[PDB]
Design a protein around this nucleic acid. Structure first.
Lengths: 117, 1049
DNA sequence: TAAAATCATATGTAAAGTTAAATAGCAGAGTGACC
DNA sequence: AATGATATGATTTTA
RNA sequence: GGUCACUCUGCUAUUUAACUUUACGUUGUAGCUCCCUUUCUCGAAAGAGAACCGUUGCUACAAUAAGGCCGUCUGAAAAGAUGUGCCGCAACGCUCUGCCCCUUAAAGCUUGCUUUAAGGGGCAUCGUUUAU
């Protein structure tokens, strides 16, 4: 029961316009993982929720959940050509040892980056 | 003479009740009695609409139909009297024999030629029957307004003279029909337009020969086409008005009234506050004198304009203004709507000059406002005030003014108060200076006053609660105290209840997902993850993984390690009684010790603003907590007793009224002022959990009594026992003892008394009878000798009877009764509703096979969705492949064994309400005679009983050779012993085709029958069939026997 | 085969206006208890 | 879109 | 400065109760019309012309709960005239009126029961909201 944390930063790169379709697609990918436990992470198809946002998803490893999640995010980002997603990983010890304010920026800085696309 | 508390769980369709005997110290000692009254929600079951609203709509369409028919009959009488037609032209009923069926053509061609007697009469009758809409407004849009305005603009534009001409030219060519279709509103005209057509037609026909252009005829016809009754009679408004706050004799004043408007303006002015630099101040006397006359001198006062007039500053702002909103000071601060309205009316009518004050007395403006607000017709306002003002002013005002909306205070009191407020005093000060600052109690509660409660559903709930209260008082004397638990659904609208159903379903799904995630995080967690564990995880993540009390990091993975982390009540339960989620925080077991019964403010010494208090405050502020939770946790100075009371009492409006009413109007032999007590639902559930009664798995109506029992044991003595126990538990201090209970083995006693089975197992056969129940309590509760006594009887659910003899006569769709010799009706069905099953029963299946095959192919092509299949128009082809005529509805056959004759005996509809079933016995066999509402209306007493295979004409006839046993209404208690089983239930429905009956099990236990209903009980060969009597409280169950057969009357 | 259960399927609607009352949320001024 | 409860055709089971 | 209840004002949302109209929809009857089954007539065919019946569309007229009534005037009345004519699917209640239940009297056939009466309640075909 070793807990990791997948920090994702989602943004619009401006090269191509983002369809309402793709917004709903990314929102569905994200919201699959949200519940009442972490309902502050919920994704709407608005530009506010998607463009330029940090989301730290809690994961238990020795389970392929995190890997499948990150794979789906990577596939979507590479397929979308107009949305950029960056994914880092941090251990939950380190994550809760960080200050509350600006926590996700610090976690991305202090974590292991998984992919920048 | 028994000391007992009456607990009531008041639901929207049920009242559970319990009687618990108490000590001399208000201690629960014995469960005297319990029951459940069950009834129908006072609303339309399908839609939730008001019953009175449906009744009123039916009544209004009755009036509309009556008045249209009367208008046309009057017009015919006038046509006869003005020498347009002779007695020869009218049939025996009173209709014109063979009048032309082309009044549109005759209208649009009445602009080119003279008209015959018939053609003129037909044009007039058609104009009066179809007279369009009249704007009744006082002065964004739907289909009606858009269509009316479009047609108005089209005839006003040119090239079209009258709406009939426009109709023929445009509508027929471009639509194929003149009148409106299913949902269409395009071909609709203004009454003003048709009146214009009327005057033009009369003058044109006057020149075109035509003897009948009489003045009398024209005036009569125009009067008939234009006149309609006023919405407000001239007495309605006062009848609905309501009393003053201070003088109940005097009625409240209208808003559009110099005195009342001055009162509103003085309130707003005196209550205005301004914030400068961290400070708050009222307007000074000079500031108020600067502003006071301004709303009379300007259109609007406008906070920004007030700022200008006072030269306030950029640093000074108005209190209670959302300055985030970008032009917050553009809001109207005051607008003397009545003053400027009267002024503008007289200005636009030429009796008033701009830049000059109104020359009318304050009293005169008061009179004008009240008369216009109380009366909406020229006659009424005239009779009211054409005596006290000049007629010129009256004409202008009737031309331009519309007033509504009263001010809750009488003119008398307002006239006393407004000078006192004028000299700078606040409202409270004024009415304190003038007026400073109740009903005998009967043994039985009086009827619930409909004036106070306007929700009909809440009215019925409270009325049935009154029935139950008066029952228990009649049976056991005056109660010592009454405890109430109103459901969350009582007092809310239908949409609100549907919303809370949807949200609780979504919450169930969310909790399922949360449990799944919790399982993923903790694969080796033991058992089902309960609500506390999900809450622990949620609080962990929502507190950023930090202990709230210490700020130390929390180790996920050790989350379920016993005592590692606790869900602590921030405010102590002993002092606040708060078990809401806004008082629960995740702390380390380490740090939440020596905290005791202190609050965070007291624990961290926030009185001295210590470092620890500031750190704690920062932690809770940075956390993902709702503002309410943050405010609660950081609760500094507070009242112990007050907080306990607010959490205990549940003060929604229905509860408030109920407590007030019952305490003030009914005799209660209790200790202290609060002899009526309404419980917080959350605390009732908390006590239910701690006292040993789980949420029952079974689906039946008895659990309501369970809730009532718990509410009865929420006594001050029990409450303080709980408080003391929780205090000790907080300080960690007579070993495993446990939560206090009303008495030993409370849970099992209550469970057995309510359900007739032991607490553990619901598969035990219920103790259906008194002796069996007493044996069960004696066996399972041998230690408790007070469990058995003379009042112990099984819970039988009492169901509100419904023996009303009036109801809906028949279904609202009328079917062709031409072919009723064979058992069929013919209804004409739109293609957008036609289905394969229906298509098989089309009348013209045999005649026109191609159309049938095309329709079938179109439905098959679109997966049998009639709307999608027939979205684009359908046409009957004609041998060669040329589309010919359109199809929009086709005649379909339906089975019709019986029905109700309607529409001058030329239509038939299905039955709606079976009001009675008369039960007769011949030999040793039972026979049922149904009586419907239309039979009651026509006054006919049926004489034919049901036979399963046959139609009504082949039914068993009833004569003196038949004993009459009784009459059944819906929800009459019945017993059927059939030598296969004994069944005892409430008669719900009788089956015309089979002759069987349906009965509801008293508690509607879904285990027995189809959701608690025994559908299809035969009675013809029953050993015994009897009718019973039961009371509210579900007691005194007796057989009853009618002497004579009751009339329908 | 009669009588007693079971399965199954249908239920009138939408535009416009004049009113009054009640509830609740928010904002503002107070009164009365308490902390 | 249904939302519900009643009325009742049609069909199966039981005795 | 918190908490609760209450009074007043403003905005907003929802509901409740009443009223005045409109416009459809449904059934019946016409007029015209679209198909079409029988049977005739005609035709080489295609398919025309007719008569019931079914029935598409359009237009009109009646009815729109089933059922009950009112004010006046003509009439012996059955009916005529006339009207911005009035009720009718609900909720609540127990003052009046029914039915049912219970209690208490009294008389009785043989204690049990039946009447009858009063009182208490439940529910209505009774009353109020509720009309000219």
């Amino acid at each position: 029961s070793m807990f990791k944390r997948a920090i994702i930063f989602t943004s619009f790169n401006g090269f191509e316009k983002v369809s309402r379709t793709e917004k709903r697609r990314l929102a569905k990918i994200i919201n699959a993982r949200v519940s009442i436990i972490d309902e502050y992470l919920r994704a709407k198809d608005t530009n506010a929720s998607l463009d330029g946002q940090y989301r730290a998803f809690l994961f238990n490893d020795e389970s392929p959940a995190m890997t499948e999640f990150l794979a789906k995010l990577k596939a979507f980002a590479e397929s979308c050509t107009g949305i950029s997603i960056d994914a880092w990983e941090i251990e939950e010890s380190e994550y809760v040892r960080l200050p509350v304010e600006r926590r996700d920026f610090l976690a991305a800085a202090n974590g292991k980056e998984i992919f920048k696309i | 003479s028994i000391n007992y508390i009456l607990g009531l769980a008041i639901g929207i369709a049920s009242v559970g009740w319990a009687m618990v005997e108490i000590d001399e110290e208000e201690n629960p000692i014995r469960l005297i009695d319990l029951g459940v009254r069950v009834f129908e929600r006072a609303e339309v079951p399908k839609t939730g609409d008001s019953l009175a609203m449906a009744r009123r709509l039916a009544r209004s369409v009755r009036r509309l139909t009556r008045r249209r028919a009367h208008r046309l009959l009057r017009t015919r009488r006038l046509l006869k009297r003005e020498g347009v037609l002779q007695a020869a032209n009218f049939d025996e009923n009173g209709l014109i024999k063979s009048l032309p069926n082309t009044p549109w053509q005759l209208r649009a061609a009445a602009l080119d030629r003279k008209l015959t007697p018939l053609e003129w009469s037909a044009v007039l009758l058609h104009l009066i029957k179809h007279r369009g809409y009249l704007s009744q407004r006082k002065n964004e849009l739907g289909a009606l307004l858009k269509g009316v305005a479009g047609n108005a603009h089209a005839l006003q534009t040119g090239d079209f003279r009258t709406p009939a001409e426009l109709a023929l030219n445009k509508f027929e060519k471009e639509s194929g029909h003149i009148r409106n279709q299913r949902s269409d509103y395009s071909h609709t005209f203004s009454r003003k337009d048709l009146q214009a057509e009327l005057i033009l037609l009369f003058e044109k026909q006057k020149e075109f020969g035509n003897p009948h252009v009489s003045g009398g005829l024209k005036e009569g016809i125009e009067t008939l086409l234009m006149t309609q009754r006023p919405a407000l009679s001239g007495d309605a408004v006062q009848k609905m008005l309501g009393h003053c706050t201070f003088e109940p004799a005097e009625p409240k004043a209208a808003k559009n009234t110099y005195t009342a408007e001055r009162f509103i303006w003085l309130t707003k002015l005196n209550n205005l506050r301004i914030l400068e630099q961290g400070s708050e101040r009222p307007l000074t006397d000079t500031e108020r004198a600067t502003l006071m006359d301004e709303p009379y001198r300007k259109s609007k006062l406008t906070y920004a304009q007030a700022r200008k007039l006072l030269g306030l500053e950029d640093t000074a702002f108005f209190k209670g203004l959302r300055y985030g909103k970008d032009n917050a000071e553009a809001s109207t601060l005051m607008e003397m709507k009545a003053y400027h309205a009267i002024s503008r009316a007289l200005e636009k009518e030429g009796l008033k000059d701009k830049k000059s004050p109104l020359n009318l007395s304050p009293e005169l403006q008061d009179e004008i406002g009240t008369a216009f607000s109380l009366f909406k017709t020229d006659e009424d306002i005239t009779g009211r005030l054409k005596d006290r003002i000049q007629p010129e002013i009256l004409e202008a005002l009737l031309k331009h003014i519309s007033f509504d909306k009263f001010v809750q205070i009488s003119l008398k009191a307002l006239r006393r108060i407004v000078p006192l407020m004028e000299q700078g005093k606040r409202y409270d000060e004024a009415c304190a200076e003038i007026y400073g600052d109740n009903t005998e109690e009967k043994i039985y509660l009086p009827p619930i006053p409909a004036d106070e409660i306007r929700n009909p559903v809440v009215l019925r709930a409270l009325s049935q609660a009154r029935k139950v209260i008066n029952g228990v008082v009649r049976r056991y004397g005056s109660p010592a105290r009454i405890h109430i638990e109103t459901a969350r659904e009582v007092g809310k609208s239908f949409k609100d209840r549907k919303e809370i159903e949807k949200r609780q379903e979504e919450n169930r799904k969310d909790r399922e997902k949360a449990a799944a995630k919790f399982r993923e995080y903790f694969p080796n967690f033991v058992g089902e993850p309960k609500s506390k564990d999900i809450l622990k995880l949620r609080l962990y993540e929502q507190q950023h993984g930090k202990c709230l009390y210490s700020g130390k990091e929390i180790n996920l993975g050790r989350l379920n390690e016993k005592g590692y982390v606790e869900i602590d009540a921030a405010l102590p339960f002993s002092r606040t009684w708060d078990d809401s989620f806004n008082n629960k925080v995740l702390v380390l077991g380490s740090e939440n010790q020596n905290k005791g019964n202190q609050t965070p403010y007291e624990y961290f010494n926030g009185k001295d603003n210590s470092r620890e208090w500031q750190e704690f405050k920062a932690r809770v502020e940075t956390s993902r907590f709702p503002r309410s939770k943050k405010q609660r946790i950081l609760l500094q100075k507070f009242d112990e007793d007050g907080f306990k009371e607010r959490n205990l009492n549940d003060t929604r409006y229905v509860n408030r009224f109920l407590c007030q009413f019952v305490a003030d109007r009914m005799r209660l032999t209790g200790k202290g002022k609060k002899r009526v007590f309404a419980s917080n639902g959350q605390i009732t559930n908390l006590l239910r959990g701690f006292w040993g009664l789980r949420k029952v798995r079974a689906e039946n109506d008895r659990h309501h009594a369970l809730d009532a029992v718990v509410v009865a044991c929420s006594t001050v003595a029990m409450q303080q026992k709980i408080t003391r126990f929780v205090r000790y538990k907080e300080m960690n201090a007579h070993q495993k003892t446990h939560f206090p209970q009303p008495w030993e083995f409370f849970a099992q006693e209550v469970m057995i008394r309510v359900f007739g089975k032991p607490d553990g197992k619901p598969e035990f056969e219920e103790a259906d009878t008194l002796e069996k129940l007493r044996t069960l309590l004696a066996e399972k509760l041998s230690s408790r000798p007070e469990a058995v006594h003379e009042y112990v009887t099984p819970l039988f659910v009492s169901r509100a009877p419904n023996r009303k003899m009036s109801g809906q006569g028949h279904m609202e769709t009328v079917k062709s009764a031409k072919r009723l010799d064979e058992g069929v009706s013919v209804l004409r069905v739109p293609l957008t509703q036609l289905k394969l099953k229906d298509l098989e029963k089309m009348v013209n299946r045999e005649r026109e096979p191609k159309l049938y095959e095309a329709l079938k192919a179109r439905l098959e092509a679109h997966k049998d969705d009639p709307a999608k299949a027939f979205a684009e128009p359908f046409y009957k082809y004609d041998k060669a492949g040329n589309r010919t005529q359109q199809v929009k509805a086709v005649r379909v056959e339906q089975v019709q064994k019986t029905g109700v004759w309607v529409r001058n005996h030329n239509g038939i509809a299905d039955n709606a309400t079976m009001v009675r079933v008369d039960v007769f016995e011949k030999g040793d066999k039972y026979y049922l005679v149904p009586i419907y509402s239309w039979q009651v209306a026509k006054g006919i007493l049926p004489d034919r009983a049901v036979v399963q295979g046959k139609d009504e004409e082949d039914w068993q006839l009833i004569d003196d050779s038949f004993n009459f046993k009784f009459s059944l209404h819906p929800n009459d208690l019945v017993e059927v012993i059939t030598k296969k089983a004994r069944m005892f239930g409430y008669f719900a429905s009788c089956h015309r085709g089979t002759g069987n009956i349906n009965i509801r099990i008293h508690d509607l236990d879904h285990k027995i029958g189809k959701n608690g209903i025994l559908e299809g009980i035969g009675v013809k060969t029953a050993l015994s069939f009897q009718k019973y009597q039961i009371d509210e409280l579900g007691k005194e169950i007796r057989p009853c026997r009618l002497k004579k057969r009751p009339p329908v009357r």
